[PDB]
Amino acid sequence: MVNPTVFFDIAVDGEPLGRVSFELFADKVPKTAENFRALSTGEKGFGYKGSCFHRIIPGFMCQGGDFTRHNGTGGKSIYGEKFEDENFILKHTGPGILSMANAGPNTNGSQFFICTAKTEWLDGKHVVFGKVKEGMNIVEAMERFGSRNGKTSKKITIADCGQLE
Numbered sequence: 663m664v665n666p667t668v669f670f671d672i673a674v675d676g677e678p679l680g681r682v683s684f685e686l687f688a689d690k691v692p693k694t695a696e697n698f699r700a701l702s703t704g705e706k707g708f709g710y711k712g713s714c715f716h717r718i719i720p721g722f723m724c725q726g727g728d729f730t731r732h733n734g735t736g737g738k739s740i741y742g743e744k745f746e747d748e749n750f751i752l753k754h755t756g757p758g759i760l761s762m763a764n765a766g767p768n769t770n771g772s773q774f775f776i777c778t779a780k781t782e783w784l785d786g787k788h789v790v791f792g793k794v795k796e797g798m799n800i801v802e803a804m805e806r807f808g809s810r811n812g813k814t815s816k817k818i819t820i821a822d823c824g825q826l827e
């Protein structure tokens with residue numbers, strides 16, 4: 663019934679920062695929401711714990727989820743290396759939207775991004791599947807460690823993650 667909620671405990675060069683929680687829209691995009699949920703608990707034997715936000719651009723997005731190559735070239739889903747664009751019902755409306763990164767049509771894996779601005783040009787190209795629930799302040803603090811080209815000035819990690827309730 664109820665959309666699941668997941669959390670990320672963020673650290674900055676190993677130092678705890680705070681918690682970000684997300685609502686996952688399992689009601690509209692169940693296959694995409696289930697992938698992010700399972701990667702957040704680690705219940706398939708792999709996932710987001712210990713991974714980093716490798717590309718942060720202030721006024722745009724924070725991108726993470728590459729737990730196999732640590733730099734934007736890797737990751738895998740719970741369904742195999744890649745899976746299809748499930749639907750484009752939800753749009754990139756503003757800060758806090760959670761959406762899938764990709765390298766072309768039907769190439770979703772584990773990488774994702776949190777919007778820090780409206781990114782409407784991505785509508786119909788990236789699958790939106792959730793939003794920040796609590797901790798947008800923590801996202802804003804992360805965002806300050808980014809740069810124009812995306813390289814971070816300190817290492818931004820998911821020290822822990824899982825499901826709430």
Ligand SMILES: NC(=O)c1ccc(N)c(N)c1
Pocket residue numbers: 734735736737763764765769770771772773
């Ligand atoms: N830019 C890339 O090479 C890339 C982005 C998203 C993905 N999910 C994968 N697998 C690769």
